[PDB]
Design a protein around this ligand. Structure first.
Ligand SMILES: *[C@@H]1O[C@H](CO)[C@@H](O)[C@H](O)[C@H]1NC(C)=O
Ligand SMILES: *[C@@H]1O[C@H](CO)[C@@H](O)[C@H](O)[C@H]1NC(C)=O
Lengths: 49, 211, 49
């Protein structure tokens, strides 16, 4: 049935520097209009399983 | 909602413009403005994407632009068959998704017509029936952007009136009708009523007085 | 007869900690002197990889 305990980041503004860690879960804004912390039009949760 | 003028037409092989003139925070404060097309009976078809883009198909006569809070469409060359409704659309703030109002776009190859108006007061049997209805009929007015206003002795009225959308006849012009609901005591209260119709700036009105 | 440490008002919350180190206990002086500056302490902070 699947094990969904393991996640990965799919969206970020820029590439990471070497050996850093990004555990923030702020909603990535793909568009020009902001979205104030809800998922929806051009705004995605940045972690997938 | 957004605003677009409900009637715009011109000669075949020319350029007609259509304005969408929304407010800020949906059209001025964004960039995702689209334009659709609905032939009378079919589903809408995406005609212009964001600001000024096109899908495949869509022959290059249609163009779009945005100049602040007003985006506009322009058709350059009416072939014969681009009669549609042309809803503009925008993404508003909070996933809202607002729409427009729709503009009929005809192409009277000949000369405009005059909306023949005819008005009828409530019959006698209806007076005995404890009710009253005024009947305003409009006919033969080629370009279909008619609108109507109802008048008691001196003032306008906005309650008890129903208005048909324009319907095409055999001669390929239009016709419409409107009804006014009245209690007979209000029918004899005011000394006369009238139905006025406006059409391409022009206006014609008819009037009837109780007996 | 004492100066004592009373307030520690830095943060409100600390949620998802990754690294933590605490030195062996001691006790500083905290006593307010009135002479001239007697101690210079210099640090260089770098952040790479
Ligand atoms: C460091 O944080 C800043 C916040 O202003 C951000 O712009 C920048 O992209 C971050 N570093 C990297 C390597 O992305
Ligand atoms: C950080 O805290 C949030 C909310 O309490 C939680 O969803 C998230 O899983 C935490 N981080 C880790 C690495 O568990």
């Amino acid at each position: 049935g699947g094990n969904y305990n393991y996640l990965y980041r799919l969206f970020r503004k820029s590439n990471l520097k070497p050996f850093e860690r990004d555990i923030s879960t702020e909603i990535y804004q793909a568009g020009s209009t902001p979205c104030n912390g809800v998922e929806g039009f051009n705004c995605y949760f940045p972690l997938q399983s | 909602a957004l605003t677009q003028p409900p009637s715009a037409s011109g000669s075949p092989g020319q350029s007609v413009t259509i304005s969408c003139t929304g407010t800020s925070s949906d059209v001025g404060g964004s960039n995702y403005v689209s334009w659709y097309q609905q032939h009378p009976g079919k589903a809408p078809k995406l005609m212009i994407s964001e600001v000024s883009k096109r899908p495949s198909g869509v022959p290059d006569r249609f163009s779009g632009s945005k100049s602040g809070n007003t985006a506009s469409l322009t058709v350059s060359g009416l072939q014969a068959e681009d009669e549609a409704d042309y809803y503009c659309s925008s993404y508003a703030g909070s996933n809202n998704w607002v729409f427009g109002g729709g503009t009929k776009l005809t192409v009277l190859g000949q000369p405009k017509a005059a909306p023949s108006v005819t008005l009828f007061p409530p019959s006698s049997e209806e007076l005995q029936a404890n009710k009253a209805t005024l009947v305003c009929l409009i006919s033969d007015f080629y370009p279909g952007a008619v609108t109507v206003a109802w008048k008691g002795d001196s003032s306008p009225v906005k309650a008890g009136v129903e208005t048909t959308t324009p319907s095409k006849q055999s001669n390929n012009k239009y016709a419409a009708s409107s009804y006014l609901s009245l209690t007979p005591e209000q029918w004899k209260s005011h000394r006369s009523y009238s139905c006025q119709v406006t059409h391409e700036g022009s206006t014609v009105e008819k009037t009837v007085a109780p007996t | 007869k004492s100066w004592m440490e009373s307030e520690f008002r830095v943060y409100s919350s600390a949620n998802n900690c990754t690294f933590e180190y605490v030195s062996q206990p001691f006790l500083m002086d905290l006593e307010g002197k009135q002479g001239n500056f007697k101690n210079l302490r210099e640090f260089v902070f770098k952040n790479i990889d």
